[PDB]
Design an enzyme around this catalytic site. Structure first.
Site, PDB file in Angstrom:
ATOM      1  N   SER A  66     -12.837  -3.295  -0.919  1.00 28.81           N
ATOM      2  CA  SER A  66     -12.471  -3.566   0.464  1.00 28.81           C
ATOM      3  C   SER A  66     -13.071  -2.504   1.379  1.00 28.81           C
ATOM      4  O   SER A  66     -13.126  -1.321   1.034  1.00 28.81           O
ATOM      5  CB  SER A  66     -10.951  -3.608   0.631  1.00 28.81           C
ATOM      6  N   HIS A  78      -4.582   0.141   4.203  1.00 30.28           N
ATOM      7  CA  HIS A  78      -3.963   0.016   2.889  1.00 30.28           C
ATOM      8  C   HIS A  78      -4.613   0.915   1.847  1.00 30.28           C
ATOM      9  O   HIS A  78      -3.971   1.232   0.839  1.00 30.28           O
ATOM     10  CB  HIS A  78      -4.014  -1.433   2.398  1.00 30.28           C
ATOM     11  N   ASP A 106      -3.900  -3.013  10.420  1.00 31.55           N
ATOM     12  CA  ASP A 106      -4.467  -2.575   9.139  1.00 31.55           C
ATOM     13  C   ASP A 106      -5.846  -1.940   9.319  1.00 31.55           C
ATOM     14  O   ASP A 106      -6.858  -2.441   8.827  1.00 31.55           O
ATOM     15  CB  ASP A 106      -4.503  -3.737   8.136  1.00 31.55           C
TER      16      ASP A 106
END
Lengths: 158, 158
Positions: free
Chosen positions: A110, A36, A58
């Site tokens: 992240s 992402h 992901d």
């Protein structure tokens, strides 16, 4: 405080036009970058590689050059019931779920790994779902052959 | 005295027309409500859910919202031979039977959990059979996959 210095070599920063959205961590031989995250790794040597693309899982990984392995961190598959370490605090492991106190995570941030007692990487954070005082963590988890993405319900990516 | 505060957060009140009829506990990720209890959970968030119906097992459960698990009490499957804890006193475990001294239970007061030494839930009381000075308990008991209802002979539902 050893986990922090271990994070220094392993962590890499990916930013969208310089706005950092996420981090990329060297583990074994793969640069753990979440899919992402849109942006550019800062070190060119990792930018000039070809990256795998995965949406259901992901993740994005590419073989790190022979000079980057000595700079990487050792991995592990021990997920015993108890307490692990994190950059912003501690991760509580119980019932196959990583949980953090609410207020330790803002959007972004992240790609930071999760470390056990003696430095071996165990997880790569992707997001999390707010859960009372004890917010959960969407995360990439791995075994002998298999990697599993466990995303708690009502998860918001951060 | 930790078991009492653990009861506080987990236990919720089932009230029928001004009389509490049962205690519904968010053990795990669900509300442990006995089927025989007729009435309304006080907190609306647990009242606006759909509840499954079971008669042979005498239970009613529904998925607690994402804000209630941080409030949920912990579960376990250790039933070693010895002593556990209760709201009104202590539960003696021997030969697969929960037993309490007579005079510690009146009608009503069903739905209170049974706790081990360090707070992990082990049982949900439904009723009991008067047995000398040492009255037994009809309780919901559980393993890795299975839940078992053990009801002694001549049991009243209190």
């Amino acid at each position: 405080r050893m986990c922090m210095k271990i994070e220094n070599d392993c962590i890499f920063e990916v930013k969208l036009d310089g706005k950092v959205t996420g981090y990329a961590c060297l583990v074994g031989d793969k640069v753990m970058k979440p899919a992402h995250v849109k942006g550019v790794i800062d070190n060119p040597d990792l930018a000039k590689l070809t990256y795998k693309k995965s949406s259901k899982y992901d993740l994005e990984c590419a073989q790190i050059p022979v000079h980057m392995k000595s700079d990487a961190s050792k991995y592990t598959h021990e997920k015993p019931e108890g307490h692990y370490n994190w950059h912003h605090g501690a991760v509580q492991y119980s019932g196959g779920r990583f949980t953090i106190p609410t207020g330790a995570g803002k959007p972004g941030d992240s790609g930071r790994p999760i470390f056990d007692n003696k430095g071996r990487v165990v997880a790569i954070v992707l997001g999390g779902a707010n859960e009372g005082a004890r917010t959960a963590l969407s995360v990439v988890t791995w075994t002998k052959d298999m990697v599993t993405r466990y995303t708690p319900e009502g998860t918001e990516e951060w």
